[PDB]
Design a protein around this motif. Structure first.
Motif, PDB file in Angstrom:
ATOM      1  N   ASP A   1       0.855  -1.301   0.543  1.00 52.32           N
ATOM      2  CA  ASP A   1       0.216   0.220  -0.312  1.00 52.32           C
ATOM      3  C   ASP A   1       1.190   1.393  -0.212  1.00 52.32           C
ATOM      4  O   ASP A   1       1.839   1.724   0.806  1.00 52.32           O
TER       5      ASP A   1
ATOM      6  N   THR B   1      -0.365   3.811  -1.044  1.00 55.26           N
ATOM      7  CA  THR B   1      -1.558   5.200  -0.454  1.00 55.26           C
ATOM      8  C   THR B   1      -1.074   5.374   0.968  1.00 55.26           C
ATOM      9  O   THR B   1      -2.141   4.502   2.063  1.00 55.26           O
TER      10      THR B   1
ATOM     11  N   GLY C   1      -4.769   6.443   3.782  1.00 50.31           N
ATOM     12  CA  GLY C   1      -6.050   6.675   3.498  1.00 50.31           C
ATOM     13  C   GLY C   1      -5.681   5.173   2.246  1.00 50.31           C
ATOM     14  O   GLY C   1      -5.329   4.842   1.982  1.00 50.31           O
ATOM     15  N   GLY C   2      -6.575   5.752   1.024  1.00 48.07           N
ATOM     16  CA  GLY C   2      -6.828   4.776   0.460  1.00 48.07           C
ATOM     17  C   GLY C   2      -8.488   4.398  -0.348  1.00 48.07           C
ATOM     18  O   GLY C   2      -9.100   4.021   0.833  1.00 48.07           O
TER      19      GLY C   2
ATOM     20  N   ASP D   1      -8.961   1.401  -2.465  1.00 48.09           N
ATOM     21  CA  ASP D   1      -8.517  -0.098  -2.840  1.00 48.09           C
ATOM     22  C   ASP D   1      -9.396  -0.840  -2.137  1.00 48.09           C
ATOM     23  O   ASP D   1     -10.562  -0.603  -1.171  1.00 48.09           O
TER      24      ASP D   1
ATOM     25  N   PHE E   1      -9.561  -3.949  -0.794  1.00 46.53           N
ATOM     26  CA  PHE E   1      -8.884  -4.778   0.870  1.00 46.53           C
ATOM     27  C   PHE E   1      -9.518  -3.263   1.811  1.00 46.53           C
ATOM     28  O   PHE E   1      -9.190  -3.418   2.801  1.00 46.53           O
ATOM     29  N   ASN E   2     -10.046  -2.106   1.573  1.00 44.96           N
ATOM     30  CA  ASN E   2     -10.142  -1.105   2.127  1.00 44.96           C
ATOM     31  C   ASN E   2     -11.357  -0.836   2.919  1.00 44.96           C
ATOM     32  O   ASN E   2     -11.524  -0.421   3.673  1.00 44.96           O
TER      33      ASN E   2
ATOM     34  N   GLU F   1      -6.954   2.508   7.684  1.00 42.84           N
ATOM     35  CA  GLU F   1      -5.343   2.845   7.035  1.00 42.84           C
ATOM     36  C   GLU F   1      -5.340   4.286   8.635  1.00 42.84           C
ATOM     37  O   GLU F   1      -5.696   5.088   8.682  1.00 42.84           O
TER      38      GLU F   1
HETATM   39 MG   LIG Z   1      -4.171   2.308   1.056  1.00 40.54          MG
END
Ligand SMILES: [Mg+2]
Ligand SMILES: Nc1nc2c(ncn2[C@@H]2O[C@H](COP(=O)(O)OP(=O)(O)OP(=O)(O)O)[C@@H](O)[C@H]2O)c(=O)[nH]1
Ligand SMILES: Nc1nc2c(ncn2[C@@H]2O[C@H](COP(=O)(O)OP(=O)(O)O)[C@@H](O)[C@H]2O)c(=O)[nH]1
Ligand SMILES: [Mg+2]
Ligand SMILES: [Mg+2]
Ligand SMILES: [Mg+2]
Lengths: 428, 5, 440
Positions: free
Chosen positions: C39, C41, C44-45, C47, C49-50, C55
């Motif tokens: 990751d 990002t 934050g993110g 994606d 998986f988020n 995060e």
């Molecule tokens: Mg991320």
């Protein structure tokens, strides 16, 4: 009657909307950045129909992209012609419609519909003279189906004297395993009978069968299905996009094609049938374009035209060819298969010929038939529908969003009326 | 039926 | 966007939760200290998986989860274990005295002392979400916390979150590892109470899982750590569509649309393949066509039902790993020919398929072979009702003599609450019968 405003709703809508713009852009010599780089000047004569002009004389599509999830539109924006579209004309939500007509038409879509109509209005004021709107969408999902029919009902309210045109992708189990699609489709049809002037019935049953049988593709993809739609859409709108004499605007097309306000569901055909891999080195003869474009194998609607009668037919030929021979072969079909044309509409087959051929072919033919056999399509959906509704199955997804059983019963009822009306004039 | 643009 | 919050209730719920989040970490390349080198990002993110992981600034990926238990032993092991650093302490919530295998204690006497704190912590997670999908709730049918507190939380969550989706993973009791004589009682009570608050529930029959561990993995006397490792793979399959995405991926909510014809008929049957040892898997690779077939072998079912004597209302195939459309299509053609597979007359017979290319991984020192491709079938079959019947019979025998009923009354419940829960269960079996009948 000059400018058209294009809209595309949901996954299917945006994918074929995008492919449609890819195709005609190439035909009108417009590049992904929007500059012109084409030979003939026929390419720029009625360019103002689908595109707007800007500084640097760049050409921007008159297109509004609509969805309830960002998915397909992010993909379209990073698609090939992605940066061609007006950035502001991307109007998307995040919640999704979950293949639910109710979510699309009444709740999640209502929350967004106003914002879309704002971009519609902004485009319609740029218009010196607006004809109407063409929408591209599927009837089987939720966004394009539910939100789409809502946008029409709303747009008919602001522009009731304009023409409402649709490219509507009818669902088939051969392509989708989502059980509720027959619900979504029946509800949509009710809307389309009432609030469109012209609807091209693009059947995914036909497109799959065409891809698998004729084109011998054993694992047909959406790109394969859409290559057929892209071709049809180019052809059907050719009489609109280049200088011509017949069906040259949406209103005139409607007047020639629609003998009765409700029966405006057209059966498109196309020839030669092509897959993106197919070579097509041998251009067809004019007699071959004709025997095929009337052949059920080339129909995009999955109906047997020999089971009903043509109320009206438009036939569009493209590429350099003997206009003399076009008339003879056209007059040949009419005279050979005269039983399949209704007698009480004289000379119901009309023909145009455009010189510029479609990308990759020398000779192409596109078919637009208002056959009564189109009922078979509506009959198909009607059965897939009742199979579930008689047991009130999967209705809780819809009632949970505020709908009632009665609203289903009426859409069931109004489409059964449609079928019977298409049968009233098949025995005349 | 598994059917991607 | 579309975040999903896992709630792990009671011992079974928590220990299964351990297996699951260890496995998820191995699937997304997340270390037991929360750090994820893939990751970029940071902080934050957006994606895939988020939806299961938030995060932080430090670069730490944190499970969107809550572990609740009315007694500290089991969660205490989490607090001190290999993945201790993965969570934040506020997420691990313990009482002092458990519910002593008593629904009444879990729903009322002890549960009421902690329900507010749990909801406060659930709420704090919801505030981190841009757009919550809903909750996943892991619990046992048989435990007092697993049954009683779960019903309480689910009712409370209906109120505090209206109609945001609530999915269950419910551990259905098996005699080979049952801990209480009254697990039939607790089962019928939680099932009744939760029924109208749950959108979709995946029952895991421990006798089925005990059977498969014994037969396919040649485990002599399966442990909880054995069952959990297998169960986690199955849960991973079902949540894969929510944690990964690709062109061929189909969202779980889409599968949900097909699987639930009526709000009460929300119990899909899971069948998973391949379950195979490393010894058997060596030099023998299993094809798309082979694992697909297993899905219709009742030995691989997760609940002991017989779909053959029942009718199908839906079929989904959640593929992961090395799977192509071409092969899946041919595979289903076979089974459409080689099996019979009766559907009810009102449903279509198409199979909704999804594919995640991200292959199954396995936990170190696991007993399961690391395969290239795997599949979980989710079916809505009338045969699932067999599970209710076995349990309803067990319940019936004891309540006839009001056996054990007094430990429940003493905590505040009534005989009316029993007879009522049992009538709902009768209606549900009846319901599951009504749908099988042909139309007119
Ligand atoms: Mg991320
Ligand atoms: N598969 C599996 N089942 C478990 C596990 N732990 C407990 N169970 C099952 O859960 C049931 C007992 O409920 P528990 O979860 O242990 O009890 P609880 O939820 O903590 O409730 P109380 O202890 O009474 O407060 C039995 O049928 C066990 O077989 C586990 O780790 N894996
Ligand atoms: N021909 C074609 N059909 C599609 C495509 N995407 C979805 N569909 C069809 O449309 C229906 C699903 O509708 P969809 O557009 O995905 O739902 P929406 O996003 O809510 O509007 C199904 O019948 C699909 O087969 C596509 O790219 N091409
Ligand atoms: Mg989708
Ligand atoms: Mg909202
Ligand atoms: Mg306990």
């Amino acid at each position: 009657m000059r400018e058209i405003v294009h809209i595309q709703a949901g996954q299917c809508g945006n994918q074929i909307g995008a492919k449609f713009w890819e195709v005609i852009s190439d035909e009108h010599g417009i590049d992904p950045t929007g500059s012109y780089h084409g030979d003939s000047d026929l390419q720029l004569e009625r360019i103002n129909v689908y595109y707007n002009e800007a500084t640097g004389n760049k050409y921007v599509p008159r297109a509004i992209l609509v969805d309830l999830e960002p998915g397909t539109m992010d993909s379209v924006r990073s698609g090939p012609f992605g940066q061609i579209f007006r950035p502001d004309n991307f109007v998307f939500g995040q919640s999704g419609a979950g293949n639910n007509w109710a979510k699309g038409h009444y709740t999640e879509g209502a929350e967004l519909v106003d914002s879309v109509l704002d971009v519609v209005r902004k485009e319609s004021e740029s218009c010196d003279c607006l004809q109407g709107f063409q929408l591209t969408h599927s009837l089987g999902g939720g966004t394009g189906s539910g939100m789409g029919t809502l946008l029409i009902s709303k747009i008919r309210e602001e522009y009731p004297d304009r023409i409402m045109n649709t490219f509507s992708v009818m669902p088939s189990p051969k392509v989708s395993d989502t059980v509720v699609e027959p619900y979504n489709a029946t509800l949509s049809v009710h809307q389309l009978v009432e609030n469109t002037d012209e609807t091209y019935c693009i059947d995914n049953e036909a497109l799959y069968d065409i891809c698998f049988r004729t084109l011998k593709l054993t694992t047909p993809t959406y790109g394969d299905l859409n290559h057929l739609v892209s071709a049809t859409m180019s052809g059907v709108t050719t009489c609109l996009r280049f200088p011509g004499q017949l069906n040259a605007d949406l209103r005139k097309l409607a007047v020639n094609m629609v003998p009765f306000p409700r029966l405006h569901f057209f059966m498109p055909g196309f020839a030669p049938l092509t897959s993106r891999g197919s070579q097509q080195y041998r251009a067809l003869t004019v007699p071959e374009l004709t025997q095929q474009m009337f052949d059920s194998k080339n129909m995009m609607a999955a109906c047997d035209p020999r089971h009903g009668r043509y109320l009206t037919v438009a036939a569009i030929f493209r590429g350099r060819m003997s206009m003399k021979e076009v008339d003879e072969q056209m007059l040949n079909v009419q005279n050979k298969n005269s039983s399949y044309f209704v007698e009480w509409i004289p000379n119901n087959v009309k023909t145009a010929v455009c010189d510029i051929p479609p990308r990759g072919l020398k000779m192409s033919a596109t078919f637009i038939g208002n056959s009564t056999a189109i009922q078979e399509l509506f009959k198909r959906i009607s059965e897939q529908f009742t199979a579930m509704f008689r047991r009130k199955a999967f209705l809780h997804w819809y009632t949970g969003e505020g709908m009632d059983e009665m609203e289903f019963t009426e859409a069931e009822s109004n489409m059964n009326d449609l079928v019977s009306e298409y049968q009233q004039y098949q025995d005349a | 039926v598994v059917x991607x643009f | 966007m579309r975040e999903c919050i896992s709630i792990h209730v009671g011992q079974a719920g928590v220990q299964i939760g351990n297996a699951c989040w260890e496995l998820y970490c191995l699937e997304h390349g997340i270390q037991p200290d929360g750090q994820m080198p893939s990751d970029k990002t940071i902080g934050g993110g957006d994606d895939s998986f988020n939806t299961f992981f938030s995060e932080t600034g430090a670069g730490k990926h944190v499970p969107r989860a809550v572990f609740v238990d009315l007694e500290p032993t089991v969660i205490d092991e989490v607090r001190t274990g290999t993945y201790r650093q993965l969570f934040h302490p506020e997420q691990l919530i313990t009482g002092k005295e458990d519910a002593a295998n008593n629904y009444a204690r879990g729903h009322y006497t002890i549960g009421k002392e902690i329900i507010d704190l749990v909801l406060d912590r659930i709420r704090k997670l919801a505030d981190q979400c841009t757009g919550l999908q809903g909750f996943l709730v892991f619990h046992s049918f048989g435990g007092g916390t697993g049954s009683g507190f779960t019903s309480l939380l689910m009712e409370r969550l209906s109120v505090d979150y209206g109609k945001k989706s609530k999915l269950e993973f419910s551990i259905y009791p098996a005699p080979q590892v049952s801990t209480a004589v009254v697990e039939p009682y607790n089962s019928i009570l939680t099932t009744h109470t939760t029924l109208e608050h749950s959108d979709c529930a995946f029952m895991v029959d421990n006798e089925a899982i005990y059977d498969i561990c014994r037969r396919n993995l040649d485990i002599e006397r399966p442990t909880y750590t054995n069952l959990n490792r297998l169960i986690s793979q199955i849960v991973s399959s079902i949540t894969a569509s929510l944690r990964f995405d690709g062109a061929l991926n189909v969202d779980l909510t889409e599968f949900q649309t097909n699987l639930v014809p009526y709000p009460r008929i929300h119990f899909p049957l899971a069948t998973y393949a391949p379950v195979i040892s490393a010894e058997k898997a060596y030099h023998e690779q299993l094809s798309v066509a082979e694992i697909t077939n297993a899905c219709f072998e009742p030995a691989n079912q997760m609940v002991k039902c017989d779909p053959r004597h029942g009718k199908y209302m839906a079929c989904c195939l959640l593929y992961r790993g090395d799977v192509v459309p071409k092969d899946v299509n041919a595979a289903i053609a076979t089974i459409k020919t080689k099996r019979s597979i009766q559907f009810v007359d009102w449903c279509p017979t198409g199979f909704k398929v999804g594919i995640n290319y991200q292959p199954p991984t396995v936990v170190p020192g696991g007993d399961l072979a690391k395969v290239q491709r795997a599949v979980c079938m989710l079916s809505n079959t009338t045969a699932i009702a067999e599970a209710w019947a076995r349990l309803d019979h067990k319940f019936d025998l004891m309540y006839a003599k009001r056996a054990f009923v007094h430990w429940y009354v003493g905590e505040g419940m009534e005989e009316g609450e029993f007879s009522e829960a049992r009538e709902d269960m009768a209606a549900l079996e009846k319901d599951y019968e009504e749908v099988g009948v042909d139309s007119v």
